[PDB]
Design a protein around this ligand. Structure first.
Ligand SMILES: [Ca+2]
Ligand SMILES: [Cl-]
Ligand code: NA
Ligand code: NA
Ligand SMILES: [Pt+2]
Ligand SMILES: [Zn+2]
Ligand SMILES: [Zn+2]
Ligand SMILES: [Zn+2]
Length: 119
């Protein structure tokens, strides 16, 4: 019902937010954060490597939690594209259907409302 569609839109909103914050990091610092620096690099200046041009206050106000209480996941370099930003969904596991499906930057349009789709 409403709950599941709201949860899905929340995941879309967060993944897009994070992807945009990651692009700002790249614009400043010439590279994306590594998997090991993590999404935390968006709020706190990382090490290994230390970025050259870190923005005061970071790149996002806070790290969102996914609709099922788990942290969003991140890989750089990604398996699915240059970076992977994703949630594993309601089942907290790879793959799955329904609310269990994995939502990521690579397939994000699929989980957006219909007006974002290309048919
Ligand atoms: Ca899943
Ligand atoms: Cl299109
Ligand atoms: Na840390
Ligand atoms: Na990707
Ligand atoms: Pt920015
Ligand atoms: Zn981007
Ligand atoms: Zn829209
Ligand atoms: Zn569609």
């Amino acid at each position: 019902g409403n709950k599941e569609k709201a949860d899905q839109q929340k995941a879309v909103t967060d993944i897009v937010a994070l992807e945009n914050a990651l692009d700002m990091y790249k614009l400043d610092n010439s590279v994306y954060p590594t998997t090991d620096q993590g999404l935390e690099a968006l709020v706190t200046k990382p090490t290994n490597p230390e970025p050259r041009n870190y923005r005061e206050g970071g790149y996002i106000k806070r790290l969102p939690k996914d609709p099922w209480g788990n942290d969003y996941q991140y890989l750089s370099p990604g398996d699915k594209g240059t970076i992977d930003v994703f949630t594993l969904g309601a089942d907290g596991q790879e793959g799955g259907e329904g609310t269990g499906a994995d939502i990521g930057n690579w397939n994000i349009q699929d989980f957006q409302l219909e007006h974002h789709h290309h048919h």
